[PDB]
UniProtKB/Swiss-Prot annotation:
From-to range in the entire protein, with total length: 544 to 576 of 839
Superkingdom of the organism of origin: Eukaryota
The species this protein was found in: Homo sapiens (Human)
Upper taxonomic lineage: Eukaryota, Metazoa, Chordata, Craniata, Vertebrata
Record's function text: May be involved in transcriptional regulation.
Protein name: Zinc finger protein with KRAB and SCAN domains 5
Intracellular or extracellular location(s): Nucleus
Entry similarity comment: Belongs to the krueppel C2H2-type zinc-finger protein family.
Chain's gene name: ZKSCAN5
Zn finger spans (C2H2-type): 13-35
N-terminal signal peptide: none
Sequence intervals crossing the membrane: none
Length: 46
């Protein structure tokens, strides 16, 4: 059991991709991007 992000000082917003955290949502909503980029090659229509 690797305890991570356990202690004092937490945020109401956390990334579901890696697990990071941010004070404001706008901060996270933007970060999550680093995980999902643009792939116009994929077959997925649209
Ligand atoms: Zn992340």
């Amino acid at each position: 059991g690797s305890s991570g992000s356990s202690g004092t000082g937490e945020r109401p917003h956390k990334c579901n991709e890696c697990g990071k955290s941010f004070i404001q949502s706008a901060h996270l909503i933007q970060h999550q991007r680093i995980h999902t980029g643009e792939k116009p090659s994929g077959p997925s229509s649209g």
